[PDB]
Ligand binder design. Structure first.
Ligand SMILES: O=CC[C@H](O)N[C@@](O)(CC(=O)O)C(=O)O
Ligand code: SF4
Length: 298
């Protein structure tokens, strides 16, 4: 029914469905590509599809449009939003730049297109340390996540100015040391894979620090993992590695923005060609330049 209807319209629209790793299992199951936001945007550049339906949040659909300006990019819900990315206002960047005019501005790929337009370079979780160590400055402005900034500071020794100072992801901030201790109590043979958006005392307990793309790449290093990220990641890992064991660190670690996406509104997205994601031409050019620079440095 709904699934066959989506496939019919996907075919008719010359569309591809890109689903983030935190998407509901039934959404991942009908997606053409599944991964993190940068992986998804880059996968779409492989084909001349006319339409992208982005099963994910606002900034990720923007990144797809930045790297695929020739595609119509749809987001099924205007309530699929990232709380962390939207804490960062342009004024935050400008104030830090005014104070430290020789410091490069680095934006985590989890950020608005508009923020990327003020960046000298973007970073992923996997390359942030290498890229920031390579930047030609001992002081770096970095946003929007203060916990990832703290991790980068510890690993590079550089002076990292987080913008905004309090920027963070509520989904990952809620993991505590109590959750680490419960994980080890219940699963003593497991290792801990921990997203760098978790708080520093939780990062310190990690066996690996990785965002979702790196969790998939490094899961080969052990056969049993407790997963410190949004709980739907556990479904993706179990599907890719059915011989291993994966446990959520907390079942109630959910991203409300990701849960705005449903099969029903993916269908309505295709039927009505909504909601079209718009990125201003000069913002996209400036954001593209920062993303391409990141690839040069990695
Ligand atoms: O930083 C990786 C980009 C990605 O699209 N978002 C994630 O960070 C998860 C998140 O949204 O916090 C990921 O690792 O999948
Ligand atoms: S999990 Fe956090 S950072 Fe990732 S999309 Fe949801 S709110 Fe944004």
């Amino acid at each position: 029914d709904l699934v066959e209807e989506i496939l019919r319209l996907k075919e008719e629209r010359n569309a591809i469905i890109l689903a983030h790793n935190y998407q509901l299992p039934e959404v991942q199951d009908i997606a053409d590509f599944i991964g993190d936001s940068l992986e998804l945007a880059r996968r779409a550049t492989r084909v001349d599809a006319d339409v992208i339906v982005f099963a994910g949040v606002d900034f990720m659909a923007e990144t797809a449009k930045i790297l695929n300006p020739d595609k119509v990019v749809l987001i099924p819900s205007r309530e699929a939003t990232c709380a962390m990315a939207n804490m960062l206002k342009v004024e935050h960047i400008l104030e830090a730049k005014r104070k430290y005019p020789n410091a490069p501005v680095v934006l985590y790929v989890n950020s608005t297109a508009e923020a990327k337009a003020y960046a000298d370079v973007t970073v992923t979780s996997a390359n942030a340390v290498e890229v920031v160590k390579k930047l030609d400055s001992d002081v770096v402005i970095f946003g929007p996540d203060k916990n990832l900034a703290h991790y980068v500071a510890k690993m590079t020794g550089k002076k990292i100015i987080p913008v905004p100072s309090k920027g963070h992801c509520y989904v990952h901030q809620k993991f505590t040391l109590d959750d680490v201790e419960r994980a080890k109590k219940l699963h003593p043979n497991a290792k801990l894979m921990i997203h760098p958006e978790c708080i520093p005392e939780v990062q310190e307990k990690a066996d690996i620090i990785a965002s979702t793309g790196g969790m998939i790449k490094r899961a080969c290093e052990w056969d049993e993992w407790v997963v410190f990220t949004e709980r739907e990641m556990v479904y993706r890992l179990r599907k890719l590695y059915p011989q291993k064991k994966f446990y959520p660190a907390r079942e109630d670690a959910f991203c409300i923005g990701m849960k705005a996406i449903t099969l029903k509104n993916i269908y309505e997205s295709l039927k009505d060609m909504k909601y079209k994601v718009e990125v201003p031409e000069e913002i996209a050019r400036k954001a593209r330049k920062a993303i391409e620079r990141m690839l040069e440095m990695s």
